[PDB]
């Protein structure tokens, strides 16, 4: 299926590569690049999984972009020093800072949305919802048995006055 | 199907983003005379599509010699600000002498197909892999044929496996202006 391939590519080509190094990158940021009065970046990659596949290019009102982690580079598929970058976000609640975390949308959901938009893909909006859920289930089952493993990332799936900050804060507060 | 999603993934999240800016990046590189004294970088992105899905991480080691990187291109995508896209320049040797210079890379989704055939949890046989790899290439060509970003700035190089010369494979396409 469509979602089966997207989920395995998200793991094979991304999570498997950046999860084993995420802990070292976050500890580097907290010790050197963090401003004096800014909070420790929580561990773990928080992955946003909107089932409607609505992915804005700019995630950054209670979610404010702070900074980027140090880059991770590697050679892949003949591209020398392919760069992997992640963004740190501040989470506001009642005007007060409630958390800071590495946060991003699952990029394959943008592919599912584009396929529903383009007639040549032959892919309906109903197909999109079924495949989005199937993507999330496959990714969870992959991570459950993955050595790089689910303990470096949290999947935040949700369907849609929904508040995205409160959704992430609920996961960030255990 | 598996290949259907990977092809659209390759177009939506990569080719449609870098192909419209590729010509201007190569031109800027060729405008520096110390770069050009090596040899000029040909236009177009040359995409290697081995049907067996054997994709090494280092193509230079695998008559194909890494030269330099093309200046990076950045953009904001899915909440990752200033995501970095990079491409590499290779010179192709023939009888010990440089015969061509081009931007060259494997299609990264073929490594997903390979890894799926390797992992039992994917439920994906080697027969499945060959079928989907051919479906991937056809679906990618049909997308590029109708893509406004267009296939006039990229070349697909599909092949399988006697001595096989990848450098000669690319050189045959590179010499077809
Ligand atoms: N050669 C090459 N250089 C690149 O910079 C690049 N960036 C993307 N792609 C390929 O285009 C297609 C779609 O791009 P994504 O949705 O962003 O990647 C999807 C995306 O779900 C995720 N991902 C990969 N790199 C990521 C990154 N740097 N940041 C966030 N997510 C990423 O993991 C998938 C597999 O990645 P790749 O298997 O490396 O190949 C991709 C894919 O085939 C690239 N291909």
Swiss-Prot record, chain A:
The modification Phosphothreonine is found at residue 73. GO terms for molecular function: 2',3'-cyclic GMP-AMP binding; cyclic-di-GMP binding; DNA-binding transcription factor binding; identical protein binding; protein homodimerization activity; protein kinase binding; protein serine/threonine kinase binding; proton channel activity. Phosphorylation by TBK1 leads to activation and production of IFN-beta. The phosphorylated pLxIS motif constitutes an IRF3-binding motif, leading to recruitment of the transcription factor IRF3 to induce type-I interferons and other cytokines. The phosphorylated pLxIS motif facilitates SENP2 recruitment during late phase of viral infection. Phosphorylated on tyrosine residues upon MHC-II aggregation. Ubiquitinated. Changing residue 9 to A: Slight decrease in c-di-GMP-binding. Renders the enzyme sensitive to 5,6-dimethylxanthenone 4-acetic acid (DMXAA) drug, leading to activation of the STING1 pathway. The modification Phosphoserine is found at residue 85. Residues 2-174 are cytoplasmic. 2',3'-cGAMP binds at residues 9, 14, 82, 107. One of its GO terms (biological process) is positive regulation of type I interferon production. It is found in: Endoplasmic reticulum membrane; Cytoplasm, Perinuclear region; Endoplasmic reticulum-Golgi intermediate compartment membrane; Golgi apparatus membrane. There is a cross-link at residue 80 (Glycyl lysine isopeptide (Lys-Gly) (interchain with G-Cter in ubiquitin)). Changing residue 117 to A: Abolished translocation from the endoplasmic reticulum in response to cGAMP-binding. Reduced phosphorylation by TBK1. Its main location: endoplasmic reticulum. Changing residue 104 to A: Strong decrease in c-di-GMP and cGAMP-binding. Ubiquitously expressed. Expressed in skin endothelial cells, alveolar type 2 pneumocytes, bronchial epithelium and alveolar macrophages. Changing residue 111 to A: Strong decrease in c-di-GMP-binding. In absence of cGAMP, the transmembrane and cytoplasmic regions interact to form an integrated, domain-swapped dimeric assembly. In absence of cyclic nucleotide (c-di-GMP or cGAMP), the protein is autoinhibited by an intramolecular interaction between the cyclic dinucleotide-binding domain (CBD) and the C-terminal tail (CTT). Following cGAMP-binding, the cyclic dinucleotide-binding domain (CBD) is closed, leading to a 180 degrees rotation of the CBD domain relative to the transmembrane domain. This is Stimulator of interferon genes protein. It comes from Homo sapiens. The chain holds residues 155 to 335 of 379 of the full protein.
């Amino acid at each position: 299926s469509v979602a089966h391939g997207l989920a395995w590519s998200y793991y094979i080509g991304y999570l498997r590569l950046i999860l084993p190094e995420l802990q070292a990158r976050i500890r580097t940021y907290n010790q050197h690049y963090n401003n004096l009065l800014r909070g420790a970046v929580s561990q773990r990659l928080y992955i946003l999984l909107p089932l409607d596949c609505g992915v804005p290019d700019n995630l950054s009102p209670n979610i404010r972009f702070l900074d980027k982690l140090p880059q991770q580079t590697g050679d892949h598929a003949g591209i020398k020093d392919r760069v992997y970058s992640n963004s740190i976000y501040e989470l506001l609640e009642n005007g007060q800072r409630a958390g800071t975390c590495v946060l991003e949308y699952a990029t394959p959901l943008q592919t599912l949305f584009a396929m529903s938009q383009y007639s040549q893909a032959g892919f309906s909006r109903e197909d999109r919802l079924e495949q989005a859920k199937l993507f999330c289930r496959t990714l969870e089952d992959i991570l459950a048995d993955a050595p790089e493993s689910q303990n470096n990332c949290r999947l935040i799936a949700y369907q849609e006055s929904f508040s995205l900050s409160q959704e992430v804060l609920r996961h960030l507060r255990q």
